C-alpha cells in the first residue's frame, strides 16, 4: 500500500496516461503514453512523488487511479485542490507583473524538480548482481541532500547514467 508524499505537478492529458507507463524511464524506453496530446479531450492528472521512492519514480495519477490503488495520503489530494483553488482566486486579477513573476518563479521550480530525477553522482554499489549482471547503485540526486541518496536498480540507471557509473568505477585509483 503506497503513500502520496508530495504533489509535484498538475496537468490534463490523454485518458489512460497514468501509472507506471508514465515514469520518465518508462517514457524514455517506450515513449509518452500522453504522447502528442493536445485535439484530445482530457483528464486532470497529478504528478505524484511517492513515499520511499525517488523522484525518478514519480507517476501521473488521476484522483481515480489513486482511489483505485488504495494509496494512503488521499487527504493530501484535498488540500492540494483546496490550495490550488486558493491560488487562482487570489491571482484572478493581479498586475501583469504579478503574473510574470508567477510564471518565471514557477518555471524555476518546474525545472528544479526535474533535476531530482538525474543522478548527480553514484557513491557506492552492491556486492550482489542481478541475473543480468547489474549491481544496484547508491545514487546522489541533483538538487537533493545526501540524506536523499538511494539505491537504484542497476539496469535502470545504466540506461541513462552510464557515465556516472563509468566515472564511479573510474575513480578507483
Amino acid at each position: 500500500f503506497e503513500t502520496i508524499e508530495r504533489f509535484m505537478d498538475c496537468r490534463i492529458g490523454r485518458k489512460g496516461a497514468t501509472g507506471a507507463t508514465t515514469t520518465i524511464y518508462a517514457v524514455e524506453a517506450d515513449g509518452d503514453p500522453n504522447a502528442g496530446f493536445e485535439k484530445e479531450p482530457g483528464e486532470i492528472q497529478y504528478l505524484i512523488k511517492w513515499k520511499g521512492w525517488s523522484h525518478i519514480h514519480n507517476t501521473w495519477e488521476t484522483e481515480e487511479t489513486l482511489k483505485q490503488q488504495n494509496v494512503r495520503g488521499m487527504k493530501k489530494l484535498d488540500n492540494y485542490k483546496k490550495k490550488d483553488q486558493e491560488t487562482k482566486r487570489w491571482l484572478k486579477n493581479a498586475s501583469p507583473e504579478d503574473v510574470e513573476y508567477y510564471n518565471c518563479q514557477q518555471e524555476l521550480t518546474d525545472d528544479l524538480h526535474k533535476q531530482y530525477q538525474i543522478v548527480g553522482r553514484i557513491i557506492a554499489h552492491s556486492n550482489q548482481k542481478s541475473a543480468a549482471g547489474y549491481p544496484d547503485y547508491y545514487c546522489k540526486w541533483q538538487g537533493l541532500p545526501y540524506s536523499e541518496c538511494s539505491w537504484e536498480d542497476g539496469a535502470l540507471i545504466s540506461k541513462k547514467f552510464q557515465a556516472c557509473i563509468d566515472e564511479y568505477f573510474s575513480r578507483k585509483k
Binding site: 501509472g19 515514469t23 518508462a26 521512492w53 519514480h57 507517476t59 542481478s130 544496484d136 536498480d153 542497476g154
Partner: peptide, 5 residues
C-alpha cells in the same frame, strides 16, 4: 532494486 516494474 525495485522499479515500477
Amino acid at each position: 532494486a525495485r522499479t515500477k516494474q
